[PDB]
Amino acid sequence: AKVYKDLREFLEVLEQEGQLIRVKEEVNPEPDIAAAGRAAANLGKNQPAVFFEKIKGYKYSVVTNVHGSWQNHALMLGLDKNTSTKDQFYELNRRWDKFPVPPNVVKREAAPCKENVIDKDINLFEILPLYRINEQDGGFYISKASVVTADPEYPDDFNKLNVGTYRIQVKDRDRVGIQALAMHDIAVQLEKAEAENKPLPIAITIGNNPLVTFMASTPVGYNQNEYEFVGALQDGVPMDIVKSDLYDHLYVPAGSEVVLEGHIIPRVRTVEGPFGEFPGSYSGARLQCEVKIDRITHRTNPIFENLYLGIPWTEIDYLMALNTSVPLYKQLKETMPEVVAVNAMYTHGIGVIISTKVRYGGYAKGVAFRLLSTPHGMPYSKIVIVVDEFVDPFNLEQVMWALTTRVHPGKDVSIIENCPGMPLDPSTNPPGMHTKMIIDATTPVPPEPNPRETQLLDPPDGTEEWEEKLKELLKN
Amino acid sequence: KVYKDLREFLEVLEQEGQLIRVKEEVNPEPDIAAAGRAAANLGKNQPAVFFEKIKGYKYSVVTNVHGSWQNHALMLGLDKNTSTKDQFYELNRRWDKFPVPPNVVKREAAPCKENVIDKDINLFEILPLYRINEQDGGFYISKASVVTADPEYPDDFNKLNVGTYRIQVKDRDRVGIQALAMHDIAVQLEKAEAENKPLPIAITIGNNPLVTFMASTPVGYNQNEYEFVGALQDGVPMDIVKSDLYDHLYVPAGSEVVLEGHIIPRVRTVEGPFGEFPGSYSGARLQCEVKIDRITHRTNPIFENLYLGIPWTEIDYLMALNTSVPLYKQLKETMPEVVAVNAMYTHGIGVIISTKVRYGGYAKGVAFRLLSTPHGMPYSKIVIVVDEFVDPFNLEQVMWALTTRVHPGKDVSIIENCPGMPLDPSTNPPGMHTKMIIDATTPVPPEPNPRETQLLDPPDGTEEWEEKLKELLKN
Amino acid sequence: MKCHRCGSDNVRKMVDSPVGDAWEVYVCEKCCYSWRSTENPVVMEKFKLDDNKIANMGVIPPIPPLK
Amino acid sequence: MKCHRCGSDNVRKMVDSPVGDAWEVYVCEKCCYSWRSTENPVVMEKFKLDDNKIANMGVIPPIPPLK
Ligand SMILES: [Cl-]
Ligand SMILES: [Cl-]
Ligand SMILES: [Mg+2]
Ligand SMILES: [Mg+2]
Ligand code: NA
Ligand code: NA
Ligand code: NA
Ligand code: NA
Ligand code: NA
Ligand code: NA
Ligand SMILES: [Zn+2]
Ligand SMILES: [Zn+2]
């Protein structure tokens, strides 16, 4: 499984596989890079990454829709470009169990991201072809970005160093705005720093190995380092990291195109947004943190890996399809081996379908309870459907069967008020706070009484052989 | 393409590569069922299988006639590869031709009158009866169009109703019919049983696929299904003939077999169990018995039966559109805001409705109408309502509407002690289920909404950029 | 020159196009709204701002006490 | 002369009595309140209006989008 050390190796593979097209003509950035991203995802299947070679005002280039298709998703894992969805899901399920794969620290001279340094008058526009993603966005945004922060209380604990993806609004030549949502790991570290009026060191990386971008958006535990997961997804091959210039305890990928070293200004909020998000709607403007860019390191001829998001199943929905379902499945399975599979591809896990064996009566509700007490599912998952072991949670047709034949709304549907919510969900009336709904679409198991018959029909005797005899007769 | 009998349709199915012949002799018990299950298991382009020789019987059988979208399209006279939504829109059009009076023909002109059986009656002589599922209570007649007339108004042709009911063979000349309480036949049976008088009945087998289609369609009581057949044939009236023993009773002229008899009044016997469409066995109950008084049939009759079981068997294809179309029309008559209705899943127990929201809470009103319709009041248990722009047939989009437009504090409503369907194995008080309505629509005034829920307009050049990308990919 | 989102005149140039005279970028500094000199923006009436709305805007995440 | 419901001075005469000098009718034009010169109206404190209440008053029926 070909493993990539930088974004450039992956892009080269994408082109060799016919999953990358080059826009050689110059194109002004405002309406076009956004439109190309929407059109690319609108292509439906085999959507390629589009590479812009020339932008009206800027020196360097940009790439959109890098992750925006199952083909690209498969090549990211080093698999055949046409590997199926569940084939990739099972491949992630395997490599995941190699979890602790210590990264490889390299000298500064060996890191391509340290080729150029900007410490005098700082200007993001000099190196990044900033553009507007959606019309009513509050400014130019950096959507696909891996952000590195460390715990102020335990700055030496490498496990508590967390890298994740957060949207970044450019507000000046040297200052940007980050959405430190309350339920994500970065907010835990920011609270410790702001409780002492101390700044929080931060490193914003752009244009990395697709696996790094993958783990960034993955809701793993706080005490789990995402770099160690990347080595597992590379099937044991450790990834290369280097220490930040300005901050120790801060490690960034060695093959990053751009690294922004800075700090979050403490106890300060400014007008961030609005911004078109994955629910297909604009998210209103709020008072969010500001970050001061202290230094820039970047490779010569840097590449801007940004993405378009909007009416669902843009590039971001492909990115979040499997990196949300896998950790939710593993987190459930640790306590409950009866769980078969978990589907959390829909709107970033706000809707989840879980397949499980029912150990004893009511066990389905307990699985839902575990899902609703997980780092991601507690604030995100609003609708949790639980189906039997033999129902494929990825097959909505089958889920529709389980809903119609196994759900007694008197008992199987449970609605719980005033539970943790996600503000980006435009349905939550108290924003960031939604009422949960649990649906037990499993067949009753003792000691749950069941006066009715509900066991499935065993197919007639020769059905297996008759399938072949029918296929054979048809070959005429 | 319009068909007058089952044989014309079978000929078309074979010309289109949607029918295969089992020329070898085959045992009736484990095989006809297995072939039916295997046929549907093929996934796509499932053909009908025609059995030429059965171990004990003289005549032949046909299974999985309706068991694929290809066959469903050829039924409507369309191209074999016509899409699902194309067929749905074609039905939406022909439906508006509703009253198309059928054509009554002389007895000599009806092929179903070619042979008559009046002496010692034996169904097994003419019908290759077989067992459908292992634990079934006996040999069943699944696909059958049953003709009954209202005893109170036996001359009103509108109150003559034809529908599909499962029939268990209990003797050479007696069978058991499932007269479910919510179906039209139960209305006529109650009128007859209230006077201890029998109810005349005619059981037809092997008909024009459109006749079988309308039988299973939940149209109103005062609407004759033969008149709908003429509409679905794009104005070509269908041919009917009067029954031998009973006036007021009309059967299709091109039927393979007609069983003329009567329902024995105020009597129930052990019917079932029988594997039904939810994929489970339905328990045995005390159901009506029918006495066969006379048989008319065409020479060399063909037994059009179907297999049903774990869902998406032949029956699930048959009921896919004949349930959604009348529900859409019934809703649309009162509420023009409705866009489309999806009731293909387990015979309408789950329904997804696409609609414009005229005013705040209108989605709940649409659900109320569906739950007060002939088929949705007893059948529909879970009703999801989505916006105008959501395709109710695209479960991916429906999942998006659920995740982004449903606030379970207000949008989910659960109502106890409503009319139910006993075949649904979830009903704890059997035949009685608690309804659930899900309002996955975007709030409209005067419903307060402090949040921003409007959808993003695509960036400017997306239309042209779609072409420029497709062209760049052609390198 | 005024800001298209809040109508304040406290707007200044943020940066010039790195290559040539292609375009410029302006920033509000009262509500942080930025835009390019090429794109003529028309902010929807729902997304406009005044000093009153910025006041009761809500912070994410909350600022903790100081100890 | 001021309006009895909102206190604005932008009030004018609406009509004269068709027969003789019986009475006149006045209209607010800031809140649409009309009254006859004979009846001395005293608007209850519940029903009075200011520029603030008229702003967030709520419409019947809603205005649709434009297409
Ligand atoms: Cl909002
Ligand atoms: Cl039962
Ligand atoms: Mg983390
Ligand atoms: Mg009827
Ligand atoms: Na992460
Ligand atoms: Na961590
Ligand atoms: Na259940
Ligand atoms: Na009728
Ligand atoms: Na019918
Ligand atoms: Na709603
Ligand atoms: Zn402004
Ligand atoms: Zn006034």
Q: What is the 3-state secondary structure (H, E, C) of A371-440?
A: HCCCCCHHHHCCEEEEECCCCCCCCHHHHHHHHHHHCCCCCCEEEEEEEECCCCCCCCCCCCEEEEEEEE
Structure tokens that stand for B150 in this block: 């209202």
Cα A225 from Cα B200, distance rounded (Å): 77
Ligand nearest the Cα of residue C48 is: 11
Contacts of A12 by beta carbon, 8 Å cutoff, 6+ apart: none
Cα A302 from Cα A103, distance rounded (Å): 24
Contacts of D34 by beta carbon, 8 Å cutoff, 6+ apart: D14, D25, D26, D27, D28
Distance of CA A112 to the CA centre of its chain: 26
Please provide residue A268's backbone torsions phi and psi, each rounded to the nearest 5 degrees. -135, 135
Cα A16 from Cα B237, distance rounded (Å): 61
Residue B278 and residue B425 in contact, taking contact as beta carbons nearer than 8 Å: yes
Q: Is B322 one of the annotated binding-site residues?
A: no
Residue A70 and residue A91 in contact, taking contact as beta carbons nearer than 8 Å: no
Distance B220 CA to ligand 6 centre (A): 63
- The torsion region of residue A72 among left (phi > 0), alpha (psi -120 to 50) and beta comes to alpha
Residue A214 and residue A76 in contact, taking contact as beta carbons nearer than 8 Å: yes
- Residue (of B319, B208, B326, B291) closest to B256 by Cα position: B208
A79 near C CB under 8 A? no
CA end-to-end span of chain B: 44
Residue A202 and residue A259 in contact, taking contact as beta carbons nearer than 8 Å: no
The residue to which tokens 């290809």 are assigned: B70
Residues 20-39 of A with CB under 8 A from C: 28-31
Q: What method was applied to determine this entry?
A: X-ray
Structure tokens that stand for A159 in this block: 């496990």
- Residue (of A275, A188, A249, A191) closest to A223 by Cα position: A188
Angle at B198 between CA B194 and CA B203, to 5 degrees: 125
The residue to which tokens 């009945």 are assigned: B201
Closest CB to A173: pick one of C15, C38, C59: C15
Cβ separation C23–A57 shorter than 8 A: yes
Cα B114 from Cα B103, distance rounded (Å): 19
Residue A434 and residue B412 in contact, taking contact as beta carbons nearer than 8 Å: no
Residue B274 and residue B133 in contact, taking contact as beta carbons nearer than 8 Å: yes
Helix locations, B42-140, DSSP H? 69-75, 84-94, 123-126
Cα B68 from Cα A474, distance rounded (Å): 15
Strands (E), B89-138: 103-104, 115-117
Nearest-10 Cα torsion for D34, D39, D45, D48: 10
Structure tokens that stand for B457 in this block: 């307009």
B448 near D CB under 8 A? no
Angle at A208 between CA A207 and CA A214, to 5 degrees: 115
C10 near A CB under 8 A? no
The residue to which tokens 């390629």 are assigned: A48
Cα A379 from Cα A184, distance rounded (Å): 10
Question: Which helix (H) or strand (E) element contains residue A319?
Answer: helix A315-335
Residue A158 and residue A137 in contact, taking contact as beta carbons nearer than 8 Å: no
Nearest-10 Cα torsion for C11, C16, C17, C23: 40
Nearest-10 Cα torsion for D5, D9, D14, D16: 100
Cα B83 from Cα D63, distance rounded (Å): 39
Structure tokens that stand for A235 in this block: 């099937």
B464-467 CB contacts, 8 Å cutoff, 24+ apart:
B464/A35, B465/A32, B465/A35, B465/A36, B465/A38, B465/A39, B466/A39, B466/A42, B466/A43
Cα C62 from Cα A180, distance rounded (Å): 10
Cβ separation A182–C61 shorter than 8 A: yes
Q: D2: exposed, middle or buried (C-beta count within 10 Å: 0-12, 13-18, 19+)?
A: exposed
- Residue (of B262, B284, B244, B260) closest to B188 by Cα position: B262
- Residue (of B277, B249, B470) closest to A47 by Cα position: B470
Instruction: Return the residue of A nearest to C33 by Cα.
Output: A138
**What is the bridge-based pairing of β-strands A258-264 and A286-298?**
antiparallel
Which residues in chain B have Cβ-Cβ distances shorter than 8 Å to A459?
34, 37, 309-310
Reduce the DSSP state of residue B377 to 3 states and report it: helix
Distance of CA C62 to the CA centre of its chain: 22
Residue of A277, A305, A315, A338 marked catalytic: A277
Angle at B348 between CA A381 and CA B372, to 5 degrees: 100
Please provide residue B318's backbone torsions phi and psi, each rounded to the nearest 5 degrees. -60, -45
Residue A397 and residue B395 in contact, taking contact as beta carbons nearer than 8 Å: yes
Residue B414 and residue B382 in contact, taking contact as beta carbons nearer than 8 Å: no
Residue B261 Cα distances to A13, B130, B148, B184, B353, angstroms: 74, 22, 10, 18, 41
CB count within 10 Å of CB A246 equals 14
Answer yes or no: A272 catalytic.
Answer: no
Residue C6 and residue C49 in contact, taking contact as beta carbons nearer than 8 Å: yes
